[PDB]
């Protein structure tokens, strides 16, 4: 019996009931839930004693439906993972850091907007399928080259920081701006809405204004422009850094190379910021909402 | 015969196995002929002689084609599903029918054709040897055992395990999960107190990782969630050291060939890295030396635990991401967990335990050797729990175990929300904890009002809510309202709530009485 140092409410004046008890509610099957226990421990053995007394022979088949009602089992779904491997991605070509790391692992549909769980699942699936020991035995000497491709993708996309770096550098998942006159034949606002959300990933504030249609109010227009004009981004270019020969050990050579790559990184960041500013300017130039607002 | 059974507890993992028995209702782990209580699940053959344990682990250099290891997963698994990654050094399984097989030389004659033993044959031989060593230690012939298994073994794998045991002349009374064995190893101790706790079992092994979330109420446990990761583990921890020391050695010795490409060199580096890892897991400084790595070149260096955790930092956040992934999958909050038991050989690392100490609030108890004085061996938890279960069920008839392990006994509709009473001062107090199992009766003692007299006990439903972080209760639908007449000033009122299988709710509020029924 648990002792609790908390006071009970004083009974209101003029309240009574049969045997000083009033039934208001009850428990429902929605208010409950069926889970299955693990048959372990002396208190379970006592429970099993009681159940054997109540029912004797257990109706496992009858209660299978009850157990199936609210239980979780492993979900095996390789249907999406099957995808397709046309021409075996250059016939198991192997070249570090200069290839496509989403096709090997079937990530074209999701790309950046992916889940670590599916990444792990796909990695396991294609390790089972293209394992050198398991399947190259039937003469597939170059299958290990593919396995190397899965392995390289696994390390590069395994850690959050480096995978984010690779995405930032070369996602290869962007829409070019619709500057073409031929492209500019549909609704202007829809044609521009997609680009802002496509590149909005790098913002500091997760909730991001998203342009809009003709009816968009003046306050929304101002908020959207102010947010995009003052924008902070985490896009980075370290992944493009020059590699170093292993023979080198001189502190001086390492320091020199580090300075060189750092300056190149700063240059790339600056040019990217300028490009984004140019796109925002072109959007403001095209927009006519400001003209309508001045007219009001 | 049931009255003459000799039962033991067995833990059977990918990396190593363990055996245990019960002395005076207390579990004790058995040491084998080599003195090992964590016996590697490795088999090796030399000159037709069968070797196991530490000798088999050492004989990897001696026999390339006669060593078998990492065969636990392959059991009861089809050729397509089996993964030979960890088994790459060991014999390649050859798809015969639906049952892959290892081809090794187990005969004594030097010009004899090597046998093609099945995975079942290998499991049978290994369990036979384990039972035999238990028999020498006990002085009696072991006849029965309870063996621990992960929760994701398929029915076909269970059948393979029982068939292997039958071929090894061992009848398996029951298969239990390693988290359940680990929790029982603590709960069945004399000093243990049964109470409602949220328990996280983190079994961190060599080739695998298991995180399981359980709610333990009334001394009985209900599984809320489970995750199993094959990526982060002791093999990866050994690998970061093999690469680190390969870089150091190569730099120190100019022109040396990288040891990672030579199978003998890489095996020596793994064994020495594992020994150095355990030495730095027991001490703050560890030595690393290998005589004649390649071309007769020796190597000797040192490494501290700080450098080990620095080069191994990434796996620590991988384990963190795993634990929050599991809690989110269980729909819970770190403020909701009461105890986290850290299990497995890797669980002896102090820094991982400290990492969970920083992840979880101080009210949560982290049961790990370096964070609790009363902790048990994480590599012995499962084997001792299995031995305790074997001693508990050694007298039951096989029909009694069969009926006791059916869904008709285990299944029940757990009450979703909480049941409590409203307290006011001039807040929801839970009496029935959430996710109730079978019939539950709980008791609370509350304070009377400032002067007392007539007092209102209003029992309502309750739900947990997180406020930004601190957990509060939110009062929902009202269940019952009772009154106690003339309560003394400062007296305590005893309130009992019973939720019978029939879903009938009995309420009692007697001061130290009023009773009521909710159909
Ligand atoms: N005393 C120890 N100190 C530190 N690490 C250890 C110790 N003993 C074993 N280990 C390491 O911990 C891991 C063993 O953990 P665990 O006991 O959970 O494995 P297992 O039961 O053999 O296998 P499985 O993970 O398949 O259940 C291995 O990586 C091993 O090298
Ligand atoms: Mg284990």
Author numbering:
A (entry chain C): 3 to 298
B (entry chain D): 9 to 434, 439 to 480, 523 to 566, 571 to 577
What did the study's authors say about this model?
The challenge of nascent chain folding at the ribosome is met by the conserved ribosome-associated complex (RAC), which forms a chaperone triad with the Hsp70 protein Ssb in fungi, and consists of the non-canonical Hsp70 Ssz1 and the J domain protein Zuotin (Zuo1). Here we determine cryo-EM structures of Chaetomium thermophilum RAC bound to 80S ribosomes.
However, the lever arm undergoes a complex motion, which can be described by a bending elbow located in the MD (here denoted as the MD-elbow at Lys305). Finally, adjacent to C1, a weak contact between H47 and a single lysine (Lys268) is observed in RAC-2, which is lost in RAC-1. Although at C2 the contact with ES12 stays invariant in both RAC conformations and throughout ribosomal rotation, the tip of ES12 adapts by a 15° bend in RAC-2, independent of 40S body rotation. The tip of ES12 thus moves by 15 Å. Noteworthy, in RAC-2 the slight detachment of Ssz1-NBD from Zuo1-ZHD (moved away from the tunnel exit by 10 Å compared with RAC-1) already opens this weak contact and provides access to the tunnel exit. First, the DnaJ J domain is superposed on Zuo1-J (RAC-2 chosen, RAC-1 also possible).
